[PDB]
């Protein structure tokens, strides 16, 4: 019948940069979770607050599918309560998160000889992100006392840096694609269920 567009998310051709991550809303359909966990094609697969086995027995009002690309040594920051540049400045998860975090290596897709410098990450911010914040401001960061007024310089850094994924890098520095499924059920009626 009307299946949930998970292929749209995991099998998409374009992935966003982590600082400007992309959120897909999923509702009014039936989702086969078994297609996900029954697969070792994934390198990380951790669910928080529910067990994936018990997923087909539950119904939700929304599933949000946030997806972005970071290097592999940072996938360990896509968890509740983690710290580091990715966790604090790009994608924060909340202390009480109910969802899953699925990642797989994509060196053969996101590396180009000489470097894929099209993937960015935020490096500076004056404060941590709030959970599920998404901050795309390109305002010059004042690291000193000099107001920077849209001009880079001494103590005046542009807050996004590039990744530069080369196919030769060690695995800690290869690009990984990440999807983060949130299983929210608000004060709506449950509209995202599993099969028979």
């Amino acid at each position, epitope marked *: 019948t009307n299946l949930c567009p998970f292929g749209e998310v995991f099998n998409a051709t374009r992935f966003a940069s982590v600082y400007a991550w992309n959120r897909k809303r999923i509702s009014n359909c039936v989702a086969d979770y078994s297609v996900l966990y029954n697969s070792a094609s994934f390198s990380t697969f951790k669910c928080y607050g*529910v067990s994936p086995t018990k997923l087909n027995d539950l119904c939700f009002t929304n599933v949000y599918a946030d997806s972005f690309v970071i290097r592999g040594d940072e996938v360990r920051q896509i968890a509740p309560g983690q*710290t580091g540049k990715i966790a604090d400045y790009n994608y924060k998860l909340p202390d009480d998160f109910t969802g899953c975090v699925i990642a797989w290596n994509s060196n053969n897709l996101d590396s180009k000889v000489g470097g894929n410098y099209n993937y960015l990450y935020r490096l500076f911010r004056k404060s941590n992100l709030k959970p599920f914040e998404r901050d795309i401001s390109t305002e010059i960061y004042q690291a000193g006392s000099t107001p920077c007024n849209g001009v880079e310089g001494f103590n005046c850094y542009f807050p996004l840096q590039s990744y530069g994924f080369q196919p030769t890098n060690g695995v800690g520095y290869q690009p990984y694609r990440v999807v983060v499924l949130s299983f929210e059920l608000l004060h709506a009626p449950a509209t995202v269920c599993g099969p028979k």
Partner: antibody
Amino acid sequence: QVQLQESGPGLVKPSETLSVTCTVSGGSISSSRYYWGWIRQPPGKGLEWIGSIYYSGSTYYNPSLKSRVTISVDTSKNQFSLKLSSVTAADTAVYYCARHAAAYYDRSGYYFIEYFQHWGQGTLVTVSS
Amino acid sequence: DIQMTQSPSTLSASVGDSVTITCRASQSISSWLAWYQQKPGKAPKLLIYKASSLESGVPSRFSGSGSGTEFTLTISSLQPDDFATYYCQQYNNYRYTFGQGTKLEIKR
């Protein structure tokens, strides 16, 4: 930032009951995906795990110390606390509370509570008269 | 019950030196090992988790490696701030046990 403060009696006396609590700041024990735990370290000696507890109440204890202790949570004050029974001279220590990393399920459904991610400053407790 | 043996017990070394501490696990513990540092009079600080991952804000000279039953922590270039006691801990299953601790003294 998450921080953790210990509160405890300066001393107790032999064969009595020892009690310490930990008041969590900058994050809420309620509904949070972390086990919260207690670790003791007698003076000059190494660390020993005592037990850890989820917000729900579910616990894990060190087998060697289970039965002399029970820890519990007051989700409403945002604190958890340890009660250690029939104290010996041995149990003189610094008592540490800690926040685990976020607990998760793997692809197959197996549960992991993880490592001690953050530590309190520790409260020394002397068994004495 | 898994029991951890850490060697050496103590350790003298000069600044700029490289030092490696060893943790042996009586049974396989996959990569579920963490390394903690404890400067005098403070709480332990997590250095390494999942055997080899470095916690944020920990110096880049700290590195851990190992899997199964033999693990190491390695301070690439000793610093005087690195005077501490180092403990390893297995977090496989729900029986948690530490090492006896390696005390690192600075030769001067």
